[PDB]
């Protein structure tokens, strides 16, 4: 939705706004223009007040007398605007005339009159807008007048800052703007003294806001540095914001009072008034405030500090004053002066301090002021009660009103936004909402008025007027959300199922028709929360609370899908579930269950207000016993029918029903099922609650899901808990993998698959696909019964290998030597003569125990000692060679399993070579002291032996890789010093040489 | 249009005229000529009757016997003319033959015969025309005759004045003009007795008019003084006009009767017949006259008094006689004689009075006369009913006729004009029209006859015959004029838009087609009389009365500008106004309003007959409030818009409307606005209904229109009735004139000038351009406040002169003595020594009061006394010098203002000289 607005009809400018209480027409003061608009902000009429040839310096403007100074077309700013209902007109006081005032007719804006001739007719030279304010007060004839305050600009002789002036019936009449009582000695006006001007050059009083209360007139003002801040001579100007008051009845002007005003937040001072608004509290605020219904309140806005009235600070605070409290402060002050204590203390007015005179008097609120102890100031600054503070974006303006007793406050911001604040000190809370009806880039003005009907709030900007509704609750879809937002205007119109204000809800006055608090929402419950898909037209009872009288009629709508009529009895609603024809259309593809939001559609509104979680659950869809029972819902499984249903009767017969998950027909696990390929073997199974096949039903089968071949073997069900597939052999083609797990499915009557929770599988394993060597087979589990068969040179079960001889060989309990050891290949081919090398020998048919191999290994003559941890049985032996000093140079490797028997020994195909490695040169000769240099050691036979260590300066080098020609290592820090020697030690041999490494 | 006429074909002369009933041919008797003319007055044929060698004195003219007296070629005057239809000829009796008569053939004017031989063939020596008359009466054969009367000229033996004569079929026949019955004792003729001639030498009977009526023959005659007026011996002759009558049937001539006739108007006597005409009354006159249809009437014309038959008086009166009334007078007279009372009383005929004899008789109208109490006269003169009298221009002739029962009378005048008179004694009214068809300078003759068709009336003059239409209504342009003339023939042929007779108007019989009375002329009204310029095609209803059936079709034409079709319903016509496009073309430049004559154009004729005042009213043109409201029309002024408009709504707003003139905006006058040059002064003004300037409107200014410099000074409007220009000074360059009035215009909002009805002005005045002397300034009005300032030697306001001393001098109320008197010049330079001279001395700086100057003046030693009235203060002194007898001869003039102080005296530049 967009907000209705009026763009600066003169796109050029804007200054003041006011609303006519009866009509709702909105009048807008502006520079060079005054507009009359409809409530909708349509342009009713435009008046041209503007550009006049003039000059501020000239006194009586050009029309009255000739001015030496040159004139220029200048803009006439609407300083003030006030509606005079009685007169049926508008006082629209401008400037640039020496401040001549104009009278515009209410309906047409016809200029009734604009008195220029006399001195009184001129208000002030001041060009600034809003620095002026005032009130129009009227009574029947022979009782009446206008109170207005304006800045002087140092014009003290020409104009009075505050005055009490006359407003005659005839706009033509000369008398206008004349002082109510003029005497040579005293006139109903207050001028600024010349002495005060000389002392402080710039002193001026700017009047922000003004209002009539009871029988007085108050003004919120800004003044200069006078004893504040202290200063010997002129320099900087800071302002003090004060409150002023007058009796309406005092022609003498004796009643004048002036108290400084502000408020502080946690040690932060807020001295400067931006705007104010007098209003009522309403029952809520008033009660906790402790006020009478009639008592008034004053919302205000202040900026931080005393500095720069022209351009104030962002920091701003909304404070509050109860009029009773201010009245007390004034009465308190007066009762004091009457005591005779102290001075009057009003710096700008009276330079020389006059003392207060004591006197006997009954000091009342009615007190209008007396001749002695005449106009007076105030010592104690009146503090206000803080409400909301904005640091980031300065508040510009404020308004407030009573709504259903709750007090709503409106606050303009520098940004062009409005805040809707419920004041709850007297209640309990804070800011409800913020809105940007206005103008996204830049600010709002003090003239912000609510409409007469109080539906909207016209918000004025420099550029445009915007009709911001005090309420747009419609945005809220649900009772939970509506009441959730908290912006006080919104309530849940239960029957309408919409969110709006009290006025908007038809028949909201009636009970439970309208909901204010979340508790009131609507709460709904359905007795049969869960209904099965199979059921149809089931009776449901609805319990609803906090709902208005439904006698209009109600319908139950499960969703957009269906709607059934309902009848009301007691405090309940009775509706029926949908038909089976209707229910499954929903259920399809949702499967297990579908929660649906059952709503209530009211007959009068026709909108769904209340909802509940309604479950459609259908047992039949479940394909298996586990899903049926084990699932989350109440469903029964029929073992025989093999169908899941809600009704017990539907099952085949009594013994057939499955209520509990344990009872489901399922296969229990046993020790792993091992199955050799090509062997005829039975496979016994255990299980529970296996059904006895009924008439027209076949027996059990075992189905193995092997990708290569799927086997169907019939089986026998011995009892409710045991099964067995008949003697058969299984195979898979490929010989790719030794152990292949296979899923097995037990079926009966052809299709019926018994549940397998564990998902037990059959392991098909093949006699040595994996083991070519006798040592490997005997190594494997004794369970397999797989063993080595000598004649074939292969390994299989006894069943599998023919017995020419009485025996096929099986490790009886490891007491089985395994023959013809062979050596495939060994690592480090070469080694150092000194020894210490770790030889890694890899063979096929070695000894099973370490103890036998130890002492077995020999390299030629040289004794080699094997390592236990390193040794992997019958596959590999890691052995460390001893001292090689012998004459051989190169020799074959021999392993004798236990004993060096002729059958029992193995010799290496290629011989182990012994060598004296030498090093010629280093790739980098030099490197930094810190080290970390990649050294390239070149030489011959560098690969020999087991261990290698490189030492530069006896400090170790970090080894990387080794080769026959090359050794690569990273240098250590030569903490020692520049230069150094290189020692390489392989095993017991330590070789050195002339090649040196130089540290740089 | 011009009237058809026949000029004296003989340009030389003219005498008688007659019209042939069947043909319409007009025969005209003249001297030496007889003409036959067409109805149109074209010349058909001319006959030469004229100049014959002859002599009046000779009896049987030269042809019969030789005459001793010398002959001379003389003119033959046509004495008489009579149409003999039966005979198919014209009897045209001449003179100069001893009055031989001629017979001219009807068609060709071929002379059938002219009997000269016998005595009867000679009628009378008398040369005068028109003194003769008579009638031709005819019947089938063996019944017939001619009755003719003529003057004798003292020829009593030769010719009979009245006779009954024979008219034979053959013009050649000898018998012609023989007496019907001739006996030795009595013949059908009446002669004048010789005795009567001796007594009165000149006696003669002149016969003016004659006509046959019923079965008688009447003659209107003029006779001499016989017992009237009484006179012992001959001297002067006056005439008595009488009526004569005879039975057609009386061969004996016993029936002769003779009554004097005349009429009187308010004690004025009209005795002499100029002409007469027998006619019918028609239904109108007859009814109120109380007559039968057949009964006749006799219109006549008489001059005042008994004097000069040869040249009668201008005063003349048209009288009337009903034949029944005259017949009664005659019967009454006869029944009386038969009573045996009195004498016959006929002076000229019977010198010795014979008595009437009584006898038993049934006296009827039929009575033809008897042997005893034979021809007789009459005592009681028969009076006639007067009709019209002309004092200035004498009536000469008359005719009358019946038209649609109204009786129209025609009367010739000495001037050559014809009057068309409806006689309405029996009806009610007088003379309708006068015409000069004839001859503008000089008169018309008795022979005036209407045509057979009665379309025209041939009017004869000495010089020319003129065909005057009875009717020539075409001359009249408008219904108002047509019916205005009153000559009864004319009516307004509405659709034709012309003026003519009933016969001439086609379809006049139909209703409202023809208008007889002015009332009938056309009256038109339009319901929406006033329509605004802004409006277009407005429905208008037309009310017309006295109009013929329009079903032919009608169009509405506002003027020559536009024309809109109309439809007829009821007794109204509905037309539409013109479009806005059309209406303003007219309105432009007429301004306030334009009255237009909306006419109706008839479809059949195509001429606009009826009109009305139609108003187009444009308010907008009015520039000011006064013109808008104060003017003559309904217009409203909008104070705020400052525009004038017809619609109230158009004004800015309700409070802004100006309906009344008082409410406007105008400047009221105050005592004259005096403005000194070079002085800062405010000028307060008074006024009424000054507007309060509305939004977007500026304030008031005072603009002075001074040719040298125009000043714009802003002002303040205190209230609806007062203004004031701000402190300023004004000047004009030139120093030419002291008092300069200047027009001032008060304006607001720049251009808007407030109305200034009085046209009040500001008087800019500047202190003595005119007065070099202290005496002159103090003399001037106290109002100016201008006064003499001693130190400067000049004169200006106090404001203008610095006060070293407490005073500048102003005549407080004339109590202010004034220095240095001078004498420019004095009049009478010279004077007599004796004195008494009035010396007029003109100077510059004299005394303010007379009392001081008196005794001041001296001419040298001689004391001179000044005159109060003559003395104009400080400018001039009029003084009278005393006795100069002193030795000086010449001396200088001296004036001492109050006292002859050394500073205070003035002496003349040039001296006064005594001689």
Author numbering:
A (entry chain A): 37 to 1036
B (entry chain B): 37 to 951
Copied sentences from the primary study:
Class A plexins (PlxnAs) act as semaphorin receptors and control diverse aspects of nervous system development and plasticity, ranging from axon guidance and neuron migration to synaptic organization. Plexins are large type 1 transmembrane proteins comprising typically ten domains in their extracellular segment, a single membrane spanning region that is predicted to be helical and a conserved, cytoplasmic region that contains a GTPase-activating protein (GAP) domain with a Rho GTPase-binding domain insert. All our PlxnA ectodomain structures show autoinhibitory, intermolecular “head-to-stalk” (domain 1 to domain 4-5) interactions, which are confirmed by biophysical assays, live cell fluorescence microscopy, and cell-based and neuronal growth cone collapse assays. This work reveals a 2-fold role of the PlxnA ectodomains: imposing a pre-signaling autoinhibitory separation for the cytoplasmic domains via intermolecular head-to-stalk interactions and supporting dimerization-based PlxnA activation upon ligand binding.
We determined crystal structures of the full extracellular segments of mouse PlxnA1, PlxnA2, and PlxnA4 from eight crystal forms providing a total of 13 independent structures that range in maximum resolution from 4 to 10 Å. In five out of 13 full extracellular structures all ten domains are resolved whereas in the other eight structures some of the C-terminal domains were not modeled due to fragmentary or absent electron density. This indicates that some flexibility is present in the extracellular segment of plexins. Some flexibility in the stalk is evident on comparison of the 13 different structures and contributes to the ring diameter ranging from 84 Å to 99 Å. All our PlxnA full ectodomain crystal structures have an intermolecular plexin–plexin interface in common. This interface is formed by blades 1–3 of the sema domain of one plexin molecule and the outer side of domains 4-5 (PSI2-IPT2) from the ring of a second plexin. The residues in this interface are conserved among vertebrate PlxnAs but much less among all plexins, suggesting that this plexin–plexin interaction may be an important functional feature of PlxnAs.
